Structure formats: structure tokens, C-alpha cells
Scaffold this active site. Structure first.
Site, short mmCIF file in Angstrom:
data_model
loop_
_atom_site.label_atom_id
_atom_site.label_comp_id
_atom_site.label_asym_id
_atom_site.label_seq_id
_atom_site.Cartn_x
_atom_site.Cartn_y
_atom_site.Cartn_z
N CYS A 92 0.01 4.60 -9.74
CA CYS A 92 -0.43 3.26 -10.14
C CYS A 92 -0.11 2.23 -9.04
O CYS A 92 1.03 1.80 -8.89
CB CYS A 92 0.24 2.85 -11.46
SG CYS A 92 -0.41 1.30 -12.15
N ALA A 93 -1.12 1.86 -8.26
CA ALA A 93 -0.90 0.89 -7.19
C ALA A 93 -2.17 0.09 -7.04
O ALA A 93 -3.27 0.64 -7.12
CB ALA A 93 -0.57 1.58 -5.89
#
Lengths: 141, 141
Positions: A92-93
Site C-alpha cells: 500500500c503506497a
């Protein structure tokens, strides 16, 4: 060749010409669909001395579409334990989602993820880790 | 009264006589379905001088069923910024999930979530925050 493939060829040419930033190593770029790097976090961090394998997958709309990027968890490999990294290796970025831009590059993503790991003061998995991983699709996108 | 209400009356009785641990304040226990507390971390922490409203909801099976516990975010209040606390006030904590025991108490939960906020070094939201909140029901269970 296609516009997408040529963009990836140019990035590969630059990785060969310029080299990679410290701690980042190109391991395989045998086509223009999937590349592998190793990522080591330098300086003082929670991941000192460890090398993780990071996979990029490219579709035909790259660089307009973001690459699909995940840590490899096959063959005994483990994802870094980090609040933005799932145990299945999915990440998750913002660089991989809403903040992707074609002005970025594969190496920029590598550097960003290296820095994200460097910023962690305490190793823990994401809150929704088990929930996410049970139903997670092949492609993290 | 019901077995659950009597258990909650006992917890309320103890709170009355011996008191809430420092940082923890009971503000409402006007029935045996929903209570409100404030929790505040003592000393050096990322949340100094801040007292958050913590809501407990109990069903007819407490203490076998866990309480539903969330930070309150109505009327201008906001959940603490924390990797295990969603922007809608929902909490990811094992004490509320698999590691709930009837052998635990409402004050035990308050202490645990207080510690959780005190152990944190960087105020950041959970990775899945926006994904979670648009899909999240009123009840966190």
C-alpha cells in the site's frame, strides 16, 4: 516496437548506463513484462543487512498505467514486516496508486519504497493484514 | 436483572469504589447497553494533552461476546491518528477480536487501548483507512 515497450527499453538503458542507487540492484529484466530488483535499506533501520526481492509487472498501457509492484514471497522469500506491506507481498503506497505519474520511473519507485522501509520505527504488519490476504487477487492493482 | 447487566453493574460498582486508572475517566454509564469514557496517555507520547472519547456497546451476551468499542467521531470529535485506529473511530485491536476473554473487563480494554496509543511513535492512519471507512458499518463487529 510498441510505445510502452520502448519506454521500458529506455528505462533499462538508463539503469545500465547510470547504474542503480545504493542498495538497489537489478536482478532480472529478461522481457518488458516483468522485472525483479533486490532492495536493501541502508543507514539505520529495522531491516539492516537484509535484501528483499521486489517485482514489477507492466501492462500495455505503461507508463500511463502504474506498474503492479509487490515483494516476492515465493521460494522461502518473505515480505518485509512493515505497516504498508501485506504478508503476501502486496504494497500500500501512494506512488502505486493515486500518485503514480508517467513522470516517475521504475527506479523512482524502488527508491521510494526503500525510503518507506527506512522510515519505519517499529516492524508490524498492516492492521487489515489477514482480512486483505484471504481474498487478495493475483494482481495487487 | 439479566446476567449481562449484573456483570456490568459489578464492573460499574468496582469503578465507583476503587476508581479508573489514571488517564481514564468514566463519563457515562446511564444504562448497561452503552458506556462512554475518555482516555488520555500520561507522560511523553505522541498524543499529549489530548483526551479521546471511547464508546463501549454491550449486547445480551457480555461478557461472553466482546464489547463493540470505538472512538467517537460525532459532534466535531476526531479519532486519534494511529495505525490501528480508523478515521471513523473503529479500532483494530486483538483484545476486541480473537483475544477477547470474558475474563477481561471494560477497564482492561481502556488500559489496553491507552497503552496502544502510548506505544506509538508516528501518528499515521492504517494503510487501508479510506478503503475501510467507505465500506464500514455502524457496528465495528
Amino acid at each position: 516496437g510498441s510505445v510502452s515497450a520502448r519506454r521500458l527499453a529506455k528505462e533499462l538503458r538508463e539503469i545500465q548506463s547510470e547504474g542503480c542507487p545504493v542498495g538497489i540492484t537489478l536482478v532480472d529484466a529478461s522481457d518488458f513484462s516483468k522485472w525483479l530488483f533486490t532492495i536493501e535499506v541502508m543507514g539505520n533501520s529495522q531491516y539492516q543487512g537484509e535484501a528483499y526481492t521486489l517485482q514489477f509487472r507492466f501492462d500495455a498501457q505503461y507508463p500511463i498505467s502504474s506498474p503492479a509492484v509487490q515483494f516476492v514471497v515465493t521460494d522461502g522469500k518473505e515480505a518485509p514486516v512493515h505497516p504498508h506491506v501485506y504478508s503476501n507481498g502486496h504494497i500500500c503506497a501512494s506512488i502505486l496508486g493515486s500518485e503514480w505519474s508517467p513522470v516517475l520511473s521504475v527506479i523512482a519507485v524502488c527508491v521510494t519504497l526503500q525510503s518507506m522501509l527506512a522510515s519505519c520505527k517499529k516492524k508490524e504488519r498492516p492492521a487489515d493484514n489477514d482480512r486483505y490476504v484471504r481474498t487478495a487477487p493475483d494482481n495487487p492493482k
